[PDB]
Every structure is written in C-alpha cells, then in structure tokens.
Symmetry: D2
Subunit: 241 residues, 4 copies
C-alpha cells in the first residue's frame, strides 16, 4: 500500500474510520469523504452530501487532483433503515436509493476511467448479507444491498480486463458507536447489550469495525489479485434473520 491513494466514503462512521486507520497504517495516503470530516486524521478531506450528483460524480476526480492519483476506492457510506414495504415512505426511499446505490454508481462510473488510464486499481463496496438473502422487516435496506452486490459483480466482470478489481465485503452484525448509543438511550448497558447480541452469532460476538476493515484491506491488496466481482461474507456464521 506504500505510495497508493485511497478514497474512503462514510469515513466518519465506525467501519469507515477503521478502514481509514488501517490504510494509513499500511502506508496509503487517504482521502476521506462524509457529510463532515474536519476532525478525521487523513491526507485529503472531501466533505459532502452523496445525494448531490455533482459531489458524488466529482469525488474520484477530486482525489486524483488533490493527491496526484487514485488506486483504491472504498464505498462504505450507507443508510440504515427498516420496515416492511408498507411502512416505507417516499422520503425513506429517496434517501436509501440515493446513498446506498446511486452514489456508489456515480463514484464508480467516475473512478473507473481514471484507474483504467493508470493501469489498474481496486474498488471495494461494503454491502451486507441482508440483501444477499432476504430478511423480515427491512425491505428497503435489503433491496439496496442486493442492487449494490449485483453492481459489484457486473462491474467486477466488466472492468477486470482493465486491471480493476471490484469486490464487496458483506457484514452482518457490527459493533458501532451508534449501536451502543442506541442502547444507552433506551436504558441498556451497551456492553451487556452487545454481548447478548453476540450470543445470537455462532462465533459468539458481533464484528468489531476492525474485523470488517481487515477484510477490506485484503480485498484492496495484492493477495486478492485474482478476485474480481466476489462478494465476501463476513458474518461470524450468522444467517440473515
């Protein structure tokens, strides 16, 4: 990773922060993208709203201009939602489609010509097991993750010839600041609530952000040089339910 440049979206979140940290430790220079990013330790800061076409279309070019090149993209930004389709509003729809699917589409569409010209690169999409398999009460979340997984596999096959390796990491349960905050606000000790949630996973715990980041780094690395369009599940053995 020494000398390489990476864009990471959703950089202010749990998995995002862990991916940024791991890439910079590995010697990559990293551009960070989220709604707001000024406090994140990174090599280029690109705050913005992914729902705005101009910002998402322009992200890969902004990284190449600011840091001189673009080797890796991690599409990690994502909206969590829930409900049966009958409980899904138009606003829920627009927000999730815009950030979970359209934004990755725009970023990849822009990044690919840059990487092709440079002789190759790696894109890693953070999708979910929810969407590879259907689950109850989360129709919108699943369909956007299924759209993203499909995109990854199609792009993976379309752009392999240009030396661009496009793959996905598909978590299930993940420990994050916001999961813990949710517990605290409802009166639960977050550490205990997290352990209990872990007992529903065959491995016995939910993922830490680093569990996910380590797989992202593998996919971006030369060890994964023959993976194209692969969807790598990282779920501790836990089935969607």
């Amino acid at each position: 990773f020494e000398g390489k440049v990476a864009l990471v979206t959703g950089a202010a979140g749990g998995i995002g922060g862990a991916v940024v940290t791991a890439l910079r430790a590995a010697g990559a220079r990293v551009a960070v993208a989220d709604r707001a990013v000024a406090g994140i330790a990174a090599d280029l800061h690109l705050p913005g709203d992914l729902r705005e076409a101009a910002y998402a279309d322009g992200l890969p070019g902004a990284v190449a201009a600011g840091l001189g090149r673009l080797d890796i993209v991690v599409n990690n930004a994502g909206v969590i939602s829930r409900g049966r389709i009958t409980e899904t509003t138009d606003a829920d729809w627009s927000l999730s489609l815009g950030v979970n699917v359209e934004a990755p589409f725009r970023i990849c569409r822009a990044a690919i010509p840059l990487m092709a010209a440079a002789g190759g690169g790696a894109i890693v999409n953070v999708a979910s097991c929810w969407g590879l398999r259907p689950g109850p009460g989360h129709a919108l979340y699943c369909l956007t993750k299924a759209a993203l997984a499909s995109l990854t596999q199609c792009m993976g096959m379309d752009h392999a010839p240009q030396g661009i390796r496009i793959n996905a990491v598909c978590p299930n349960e993940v420990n994050t600041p916001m999961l813990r905050t949710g517990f605290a606000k409802r009166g639960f000790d977050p550490d205990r609530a997290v352990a209990e949630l872990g007992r529903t996973v065959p491995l016995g715990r939910i993922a830490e952000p680093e569990d996910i980041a380590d797989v992202v780094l593998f996919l971006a690395s030369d060890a994964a040089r023959y993976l194209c369009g692969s969807l790598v599940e990282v779920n501790g053995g836990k089935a969607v339910a």
Copy 2:
C-alpha cells in the same frame, strides 16, 4: 380464475399481452396499464406513465374501485438498457430505476393493504435471470432486476402472513417487441437475430411470451398456493452470458 380481478402493467408489450390474454381466457377480469392501452381487449383501461408517483401509487386503488376487488397484480412493465456502468447515463439511470424498481415498489405498497383487508391475493413480478447472476455489459439492467428479485423475496416473507403470495418469474431470453427493437437498432434483422439467439439455448429455442405467461398463471393459481417469495427461473437451461 373465474371471478378474479387482475392488474397487469406493461400490458401493451409482448409478455404483458400474453398474460392479459391468458388471464382473460381463464375467466379473470383484467385491468391493463401501460403508456397507451387503447388497442387492448380488457375489462378496465388505465393508461399512464409508471414514472409518475401519483399514477403508480394510485393503480391498485383504481382497479379495486373500478372492478370491485383486486386479486392479482402482475408487475410486468420493464425497461431494457445496456452498457457497462461507464457507458450508463444519468437519463438511463432515472428511467430504469423508476420503471423497474420504484414503480413495483409503489404498486405493491398500495396493493398490499387492499389485498390484506380482502383476505389475501397474489403478486407476480417479472424479474430476470440477469440480476440473479451477473452478465457482461448490462450493469444497470442487472442491478434493477436484482433489486426487484430482492424486493419480491422480502415482501414475500413480510406479507405471506396476510395471505398475500408474492413471487417472481425470471426469464432469460424471450422473443418480444423490445428484444427485436433492440436488435434492429444495432442494426441486425430482428427475425434472424432472434433465430440465432434461440440456437444458444440448450432447449433449442427462444422463449415465446406464452412460455412466460403460462408460468405467471401458475404463480397466481391455487397450484402455487405454497410458494411465497420464490424466484422461478424460466430460461430453457441457458446460463446468463
């Protein structure tokens, strides 16, 4: 099917037309929806543009009000786009998402409460093997079909408790006006191109609209009473390629 009322979208196209014909022959009353449906023999005509929120939201209620009940919805309307994602325009994106994914969402969101209050019903979505598996140079088409397959499965499990049976038929190659049109534009004689395409199918022929319509009818019939959230592939043995 006697006494039953069905809504069919994309009623003016190849598969839609075969579906309308088959339901009517079997004694159902059919409401037909498409941009224009004036030519079509049917029990209720509902012209409009699926991209319009209010029209899509309103379709199921228009059928229940017009014909007195709503037993079956066939989401058959669909747009074909082609290209690697680097060749996919913003106009392409809006069109495919709006018609292939957002329209079925709006129609199901509206139909489900109506059917639930009436003791159940059946929804059949026409998705595609392209989507279930990735194919070259059709990134947008695949991702919309994968989103629709995922929605089918999630809704199928969310709403089976209300007696609503939601499944999808997933064709691969079908001889339809749009498949032909696509060839002519490129610019091969459609009849020759269709014949050549038929030869790439292990079964030894391209599917006709009736091959698909017969499966849609199965899915809406009592024979399929235990199928919920199933994705029924109808590909003559041919892999996505």
Copy 3:
C-alpha cells in the same frame, strides 16, 4: 392432452409427498409405476418394490418401467432419508445411508432414464430436494450436503439434457406435514394436529405444507405449462427461511 396416456415413475411412493404425487398423476390420467421398500397396498399401475441403496435396483428402475408400461415420460425422484446432527455426530452408517438414497440413487435413476427418454422424443424429471442445502442450516450437515448435491445435479442435468427435450427441475420444500413428523409428535404425548399447527406459526404463510401443496408443484413441473423450465430449483417454502 395433458398427462393422459403418459407413464410416470415415482419413488418414495409410500411416503407423504410420494403418495400425493401418485394420486394426482393418476387422477390426471397418467399410468404410474410406484417404487418404495414395500408398495403392495398402493393403488398404482405397476409395482416395483426395492431398496434404492442397491445399485442394480436403482440402475434398473427406468428400464423396468419402460418394459412394464411400454414407455417412460416422467420420473419423480422423491425418496429421501431424514437425518440430523453436526458432522461430529454423524456416523459412517449415517453417511452411507443418506448418500446412497439421497444422491447416488437419483444419479443412477437419471443416468438410466435419460437415454430412454431421449430416444422417445423427450420427458420430464422432477427431483424433490430441499431449501436445506440451498442454504446452510444448523445441526443437519449430512442432510444439507445431500440436498445441495441433488440440487446441483438437477441444474447440471437440466442444462446438459434440455437439447434432448428432457426437462429436469426440482421442487425444494422446507416444512412439510409427514407421517414421520406426526408420529414423532404423537410419541411425545403431543396432539399431532396442534403440534403441526404450532410449527406452522414459524412459517410466514402460517402453516407447514401438506403433501398435496408439494405434489401440485411437482405436477406443474411435469406439465406443458412448464415447457420452458430446465434446471430450475423451485422453492416451495411458504416464505420460511432455512433455520
């Protein structure tokens, strides 16, 4: 028209789904040859008792049907052994039994049936597999792998033999109301109907399948309405995910 004048072989014909498939086919006008360990009580058009684990019996089944009824249009591979346990609790005997009946036997039957059907202009083969196997489930390793194997075989054969006019597809149930299931409940002092209803509550549809729920899909797959289906794995699960 339809199944009139056609001949079918159904295995596991004394069991729940098998028995429902035999009845439905004969009502639709087909003559049916039944196979199971014992079949004497079964109303059918040819009786072929035997042990599917014996290579000679499984190899010879389609030919015995063609000789006995004059033709072979449809094969329903329905026989299956139920097993459970993590792989660490799976014995060599468990292994030999499940592989022999769930995988090796349909392999032998289809290998023998395909040439006969190819020579006669085509036919239909329907395998009863399981959603367990399509997705993994806890504590049933052997059951799952045999069902996965059968599902894979269905798809490869479906693709390989469609050019011969042979349509090979599978039905994949999840929860089904069988005599083994009901006997199991009866012995725990349960009311089997109530216990069956209770197990139904774990299915989004709200009930487990009756054997007729499954048989009507088997009939669809062997019928003209399914003429464009080759290598399809048709899930019939009432919405219930493997768990």
Copy 4:
C-alpha cells in the same frame, strides 16, 4: 502463523504445493498428505490414500501426535472428472465421491474435536465455482463441489461456537499439473487459450489461490465463518 501447525492434503499437486510453501514461509509447521509426498519440503510427511477410511479418519490425530498440535486444516485433495451424467461410470462416481466429499468429511469430523479442545482452529476447503453454479458436461464434478461447499457452510455455523473457523476458497480456472494432464491437445497452448476466456485476462496460478487460503487461515479472517470465497478472475462458470 509462527508456531502453528497445518495439515495440507493434495500436497503434491499444484495448489497444494503452493499452499505448503506459503504456510512454511509464514512460519507455520506443515504436515503434508498425498499418495506420495517424498519430494516435498515439510515438517511431517503423511503419505496415504484418502479413499481408505482409516487413513482419512486418522490424519488429524496423526498430525497432533507428530507435531504436538493441530491449528489449520486445508482440504485440497481433489479429483477432476468430466462428462454428462449419462457418460459417468460407477468407478468415476466412487472415485469422485470418495476423494472430493467423503475424505474432507472424515478429516473434518476427526479434526474438529481436537481443535475444539485446544481452543479453536481454521479449516479451509478448496471447492469450486463449478458446483456453486452449474456448468455443461461436468455433472459429477459440480455435484461433489456443491456438496463440499454446503458442508463448509453448515460446519462453519455448527463449529464457530468452538472457535473453529470453517471456510472455502472456490477457484474457477487454475494452471495446475493436473489441468495440463488431461489436456495432453498441447498443454501450454491450451492453458494460454483458456487464459484468454478470463476477463482478468489470465488463468490463476497456484499462488493466486494459495494466498487466499492463507488469508482465510489467518487472523485477518477471524470473523469469517462458513464463507465461500470465489476466486475466478471475473469468469462465470461455462
């Protein structure tokens, strides 16, 4: 990997050899299993026939007895068959089921208790994209690889609680001595031609697969259980 012990089956073959090399380079001690393993640099040699129940049942215990512990099992032995089902002989069936499915079954069944008692481990099965998706004219091969992928996933769920991580790597096209045999068509021309049907633009070398095996055995994959990791260079099954 320093101080860990791995068992690698099919160790005399292309992928097996590259896996053994990679593990020892990372500091693991490796026991090698195949029909003959005399030539292979390793810390324990366990030659034998996987079709023999006793041999397969005894492999994990032999490694624990010989090197003192068992941390990693790579089920890599495999038999290549071809044909439609109607061209598949009884001998083909026995050979493929025996080596591709029963052997890993026996090995995992024996390895699991040992690993569980030690606090955990990793098992990596080399399955295939063929089997996950169906492909023309290889019915026996596909079904055995499908069986093995299913076993991997079920075992992954069943034994994660004991700290055992069970996963599979699923190659498509790979340049291996065995591929080249069975071609002999001229081998290196055939390998190069096959190479050009892969969107990446080349077929995998054994090291391309071995590096994924190593990832899956490693600490970076500590949250993967029952995952089937495809390594196909973008190439769909066909």
